[PDB]
């Protein structure tokens, strides 16, 4: 057996544009954070490695408002700790009941299925969200093991209100389970406060960092419910029974984690508490508002109902008479900005502004403002 | 609610310990694949990183020598290739036989049967390796949809030869899947000439990367019973039928790929295709018995049969009277050097020495003598 060669490229070391990322996600790292993965690595169970995990996890804790002593970072994107919350907390017949406002409670209906949930929905047009008497309604008639909701609904610009919904699933003897990707870092998230059983989120976005190191959390009455199920977590990757074992005090090895990612999730995660959890949502508010009146300015229209828009993401309508696709590519390719399009129901509707982490910051309204004005000529 | 600041940890920026990691794993990264995690990110869905998805796709076919259109990086370390192998083609009361001769065996028999596999074994001592004719006696009793081995046995130091493995699976409609984490890129490997039908590796090892960006492939036939499944794949972050569309022509968003990885891998392997595969397999091979001499030179032996010892992992053995976890831990605090302990069959029996990707070098073992022979006195 002689080496086939026609594949083996002859490439020059690597060269990418710049991009200002005003979109769904990622958002440009902070270059402290992308400086921190330039280190080099030691072993995955090395005590100085250990104690930088416990660093995360406390970091972690944070930025969450959470006590919970299981909380990780998974070695993985969003949709991998996403996964995580459905893999450990849904066993074959139990009821999931997820509200689909957006494109991600749809995936979350999906994923539930393949864990073997009897999957119930409730839904609201996308930008709009669940009050707590129709939330009622449906724990009434559905009376889950598991109630999931986002959020921060990334496709819809929407922040689902959580206050009362704690006690509302306690009421029922249901779990609640959130995705909060988009909201963590740049919006008020009290997860205990919340009453919220599982959470995930992401490392790309109001953290600051690259994808990769999701955080990911479950409470006291979660893992009760983990610790009950009749067979083993149907994912090993993603299995919490394994992988507390390795961030708890047994340091059993389960998987090599990701270095140098930890790494840059470590100085995100510092950065964040030296700016201090106030302050960072304080800037995401303002830098929200900032944009807000410069859209008007430019006579842009919102999606969203102002209480409910999310400073991290900004549906922006898009006008009668205007490509929206070909806004985007021009933005990208005349202007090196990124922002989203539509999708499902908001496909050709909106525009999506992502202003997270080191982007929310004024700089990036004002090289996305001209340069939409410009597009839209 | 007013902010916990309980967990707000006041950290400095980042210092961790020099290291050299002769393992069972992670290396250390090459410094220019390091350099290139140090970049700002561009969108999982830019143009410029489709491009560089494009070509760590072409390099993943020269490095492992297949042409497999679906061979891809998956976002995860070597545990997500590993079970992204098993849930695309493991179907509940699929028949999976598993030649158990080490830990990762083990594994594979633990994930099998989460995805609802009936699951056979045969079994070797670990350091040992099966036969075409052990082989065949047992693809005759189980009569498997699935036969599973590990190539490079870390656990053990043995390389599971797999010339004619390919054909006697033809024989018995069997799809072949094998574990190359320990040997891509620094032991021959010929996918496609030897009728391997899944396949996954590792980026932190001979690809001299940091973990994350895991090599995976199917052949046709794999394609096929992933294409007859009467239920989707029970994994929604591994399912292929998803990440074939966001690796494919159609760019179906499906997760946020993490761009600083990816750029890491796409390096890692622009320098492999560089040296070039024969020259990268020589040098692996020429250091590993300069290793051999040297242990021998101090009066240490191996425990693995010269014709199966993998040049990647090295099991020594412990002499009697000798604590090897102490050793173990000696040799990282006094002398900076990582190298592994044995589990299982070969727990208190081996220590295991890496010498993989950019530590694949005398400088490594030279390193590691004089270290071993200051503690061993
Ligand atoms: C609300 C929400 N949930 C989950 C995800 C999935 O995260 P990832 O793309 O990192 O896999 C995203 C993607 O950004 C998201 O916006
Ligand atoms: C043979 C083998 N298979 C699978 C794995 C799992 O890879 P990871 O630790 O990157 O999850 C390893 C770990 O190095 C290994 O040595």
Same mark, same amino acid.
């Given at each position: 057996i002689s080496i086939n060669d026609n594949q083996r490229l002859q490439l020059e070391p690597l060269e990418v544009p710049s991009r200002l990322l005003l979109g769904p996600g990622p958002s440009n790292a902070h270059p402290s954070v992308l400086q921190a993965m330039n280190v080099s690595p030691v072993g995955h169970l090395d005590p100085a490695f250990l104690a930088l995990m416990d660093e995360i996890q406390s970091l972690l804790r944070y930025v969450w408002q959470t006590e919970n002593p299981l909380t990780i970072a998974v070695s993985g994107t969003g949709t991998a700790a996403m996964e995580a919350t459905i893999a450990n907390a849904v066993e074959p017949g139990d009821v999931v009941l997820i509200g689909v406002a957006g494109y991600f409670g749809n995936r979350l209906v999906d994923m539930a299925g393949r864990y073997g949930a009897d999957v119930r929905t409730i839904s609201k047009p996308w930008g709009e969200v669940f009050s707590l008497e129709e939330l009622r309604t449906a724990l009434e008639t559905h009376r889950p093991a598991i109630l999931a909701l986002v959020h921060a609904e990334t496709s819809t610009g929407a922040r689902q209100p959580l206050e009362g919904v704690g006690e509302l699933c306690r009421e029922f003897g249901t779990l609640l389970l959130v995705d909060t990707v988009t909201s963590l870092g740049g919006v008020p998230i009290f997860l205990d406060a919340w009453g919220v059983d599982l959470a995930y989120s992401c490392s790309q976005k109001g953290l600051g960092c690259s994808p990769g190191a999701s955080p990911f959390t479950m409470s006291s009455r979660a893992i009760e419910k983990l610790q009950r199920r009749?067979?083993? #977590?149907?994912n090993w990757y993603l299995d919490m029974n394994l992988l507390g074992k390795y961030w708890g005090s047994?340091? #059993?090895?389960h998987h090599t984690a990701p270095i140098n990612l930890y790494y840059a999730l470590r100085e995100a995660l510092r950065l964040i508490a030296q700016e201090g959890l106030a302050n960072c949502w304080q800037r995401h508010q303002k830098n929200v508002e900032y944009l807000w009146e410069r859209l008007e300015d430019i006579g842009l229209s919102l999606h969203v109902e102002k209480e409910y828009r999310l400073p991290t993401l900004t549906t922006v309508c898009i006008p009668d008479g205007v490509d929206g696709k070909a806004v985007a590519r021009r933005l990208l390719n005349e202007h090196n900005i990124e922002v989203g399009g539509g999708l499902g129901e908001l496909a050709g509707k909106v525009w999506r502004v992502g202003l997270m982490g080191?982007?929310?910051?004024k700089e990036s309204v004002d090289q996305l403002i001209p340069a939409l004005e410009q597009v839209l000529r």
């Open positions: 009749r067979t083993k #977590v149907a047994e340091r #059993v090895y080191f982007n929310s910051r």
